[PDB]
Amino acid sequence: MKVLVVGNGGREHAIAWKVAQSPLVKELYVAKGNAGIWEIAKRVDISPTDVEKLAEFAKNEGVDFTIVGPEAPLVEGIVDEFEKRGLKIFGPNKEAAKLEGSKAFAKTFMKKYGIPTARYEVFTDFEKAKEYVEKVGAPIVVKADGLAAGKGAVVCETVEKAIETLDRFLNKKIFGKSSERVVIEEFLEGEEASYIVMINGDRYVPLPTSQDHKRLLDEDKGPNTGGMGAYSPTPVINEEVEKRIREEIVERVIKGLKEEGIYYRGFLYAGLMITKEGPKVLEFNVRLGDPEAQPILMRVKNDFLETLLNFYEGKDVHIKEDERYALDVVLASRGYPEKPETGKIIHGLDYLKSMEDVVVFHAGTKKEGNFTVTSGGRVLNVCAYGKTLKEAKERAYEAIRYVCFEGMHYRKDIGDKAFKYLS
């Protein structure tokens, strides 16, 4: 068949990489892609968020199946549009999208339905927010309601930082139509980790477990980014903790969707905090995370295309998780996250293509002639397998020594939190 991935980023490289592996696909299109994806997939030069021109293109072209990468297409109703046009597409519809696409919706779900989450008041007047920060204190945490391109949640150490944040969101509306409603939750402590499932109505298959590293620098310092690296499986989520997420989060999220008559066909990624008091939802995402998809997807041993197709229509599916660990180290350009400098030649990619058990997932890459150059803030994911995490981490830094672009920055400590739980 003819499969299409929507998105341009390292997640979507992962999606098409794993998919190109299935003997079922005969042509692979990506809607826009990056220099990395173009080695495998026809580039379609239509924006991911250009949802009606996407659908018509996929309709004329005869695209037999399509998977969505990023949140914004999902949310703007891509799924709705595909269906108009008789199209098989994996991802939530626009109505189901609201679990990410409006935070205070999901926060009302979660409490209307018993899912462990962080104490919340939702505010649309700037003045009524104001004294609730000084009423319950510092901690606190302040979040835009809509897509702010990940750029929307603000952990505040002081009340002043919190009000300053609320000011930019609610008064200045930096974020537009999506900052004019806030969320103020308690700051939770513990290890964060991610749980990911595919949901199709009332069935759900889990996905490899995974931990992201959001901060820029080594020892969890610097600005907070979209993720600088991930690894799978994370030992943060036990047996006992897993057993808990499934019961207390996913299956409640499952009754809730029944009780609202909201039909969910897609990925659901809980971003969690494992507190001492149990696993809690910090947020819901309606797609794979980036860079978490990358190692999750390395660890999917069976034909993911076929599992998608099959899950897609009510059929019955499993995941063989690979027994090797998978670690993905993110290469950023100078200036990331606030203003990334771009245009830099990338050298030594061809050395990584003969290195055992290394996998490169392009982020921000485009072509300038016969050069591969940076296009963006996050550029490369140099990933690897290991019999242990130690090995996965070592093989990913070994690989990195061969590759390079001016300005390149990466964290050296990806996986490091897993080593206390391991032996």
141 is known to lie in a ligand binding site: yes
194 is known to lie in a ligand binding site: yes
176 is known to lie in a ligand binding site: yes
159 is known to lie in a ligand binding site: yes
Q: How far apart are CA 18 and CA 376, in angstroms?
A: 23
145 is known to lie in a ligand binding site: yes
341 is known to lie in a ligand binding site: no
163 is known to lie in a ligand binding site: yes
72 is known to lie in a ligand binding site: no
174 is known to lie in a ligand binding site: yes
129 is known to lie in a ligand binding site: no
Q: What is the strand order of the sheet 153-155 is part of?
A: 120-123, 182-185, 141-143, 153-155
Q: How far apart are CA 357 and CA 383, in angstroms?
A: 9
153 is known to lie in a ligand binding site: yes
**DSSP letter assigned to residue 50:** -
239 is known to lie in a ligand binding site: no
* Residues contacting residue 157 through CB under 8 Å, at least 6 positions apart: 138
Q: How far apart are CA 337 and CA 301, in angstroms?
A: 33
* Residues contacting residue 79 through CB under 8 Å, at least 6 positions apart: 68, 89, 91, 92, 93, 94, 96, 97
183 is known to lie in a ligand binding site: yes
94 is known to lie in a ligand binding site: no
Torsion sign over Cα 341, 411, 301, 310: negative
248 is known to lie in a ligand binding site: no
137 is known to lie in a ligand binding site: yes
323 is known to lie in a ligand binding site: no
Q: How far apart are CA 111 and CA 108, in angstroms?
A: 5
148 is known to lie in a ligand binding site: yes
393 is known to lie in a ligand binding site: no
139 is known to lie in a ligand binding site: yes
290 is known to lie in a ligand binding site: no
81 is known to lie in a ligand binding site: no
| Phi, psi (rounded to 5 degrees) for 325 | -75, 155
164 is known to lie in a ligand binding site: yes
95 is known to lie in a ligand binding site: no
82 is known to lie in a ligand binding site: no
395 is known to lie in a ligand binding site: no
Neighbours of 178 (CB within 10 A): 20
39 is known to lie in a ligand binding site: no
186 is known to lie in a ligand binding site: yes
278 is known to lie in a ligand binding site: no
237 is known to lie in a ligand binding site: no
178 is known to lie in a ligand binding site: yes
334 is known to lie in a ligand binding site: no
388 is known to lie in a ligand binding site: no
285 is known to lie in a ligand binding site: yes
165 is known to lie in a ligand binding site: yes
170 is known to lie in a ligand binding site: yes
283 is known to lie in a ligand binding site: yes
169 is known to lie in a ligand binding site: yes
157 is known to lie in a ligand binding site: yes
On the 0-12 / 13-18 / 19+ scale of CB atoms within 10 A, 176 is exposed
155 is known to lie in a ligand binding site: yes
138 is known to lie in a ligand binding site: yes
Q: How far apart are CA 139 and CA 133, in angstroms?
A: 9
142 is known to lie in a ligand binding site: yes
339 is known to lie in a ligand binding site: no
261 is known to lie in a ligand binding site: no
268 is known to lie in a ligand binding site: no
147 is known to lie in a ligand binding site: yes
160 is known to lie in a ligand binding site: yes
| Phi, psi (rounded to 5 degrees) for 118 | -105, 140
Q: How far apart are CA 298 and CA 304, in angstroms?
A: 11
166 is known to lie in a ligand binding site: yes
On the 0-12 / 13-18 / 19+ scale of CB atoms within 10 A, 249 is buried
280 is known to lie in a ligand binding site: no
Known binding site: residues?
Answer: 133-194, 283, 285
Binding-site residue set for Mg(2+): 283, 285
> Which residues are annotated as part of the binding site for ATP?
133-194
